Amino acid sequence: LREVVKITVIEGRITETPKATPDPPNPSGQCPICRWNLKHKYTYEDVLLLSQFIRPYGGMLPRRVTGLCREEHRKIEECVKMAHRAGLLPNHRPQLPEGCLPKDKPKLNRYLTRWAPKSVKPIYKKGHRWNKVGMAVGSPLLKDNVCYSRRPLKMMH
Amino acid sequence: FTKSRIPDKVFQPKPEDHEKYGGDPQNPHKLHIVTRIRSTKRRPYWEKDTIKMLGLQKAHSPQIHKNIPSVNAKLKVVKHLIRIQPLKLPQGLPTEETMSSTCLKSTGELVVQWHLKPVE
């Protein structure tokens, strides 16, 4: 990992970075997720896995560097938003300018948030029994995850 | 809405079918166990008549019928309202002595000695 330091004279110094744990359980796996047999076994709660693909300020790393396949990139990206919105990444906050401060409001606890809270309209007319307007929970990208319930998960609440 | 004639292919079994249901295409069974498991209400009148002809007026009570084509022809009419199970005789046909000691099991077996005791 190379970091640029300024003095004007500016220079970038390369530092050694920790390497991947040797001996993946499932060698010959193209993408990193599949090498460790994690194709359908991670959710937004798995911060330890997700944090590895996150920039120090909460941004997602580019697909090329991580090497993830498109299908898993989309899944990893979506869970991180849900992880961020659920307050599971307190140390990856945005780099607010020195002239700015947090919004200072109390924070409502959330989890499994598909959309950005700012831009969701209220459901004033909810509808009757076989007319109900549904409140989305979770992300459709994760429908293929392993399910340990009698029937498939209730996405629409 | 009229009576329908089922294509003959429906009643021609396949080799795997014999494996699944465990019936030999040779030495076919002799007697049916037939029980009505659905209602004749809301069904066409011809279905109502065949049910009375076969004796299946009460539901979930088994009736014994001949595995012969003429009987089979009526059974095909009400195939959807009944359950057909092959009668089995593990200990042979009942005799005069064993006529009063029989019991028909849910498995399809007519046992001729019914003791109501642990197998031991």
């Binding site: 076989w130 | 009643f11 079994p13 019936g23 049916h32 498991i37 089979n72 959807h80 057909i84």
Partner: peptide, 27 residues
């Protein structure tokens, strides 16, 4: 209007019983 899970399972059961009726009527 979708069809419940109870409704689709129960019919398949009845179909399987009727499927066996086809076999026992062929001998």
């Amino acid at each position: 209007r979708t069809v419940s899970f109870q409704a689709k399972e129960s019919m398949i059961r009845r179909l399987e019983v009727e499927a066996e009726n086809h076999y026992w009527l062929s001998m």
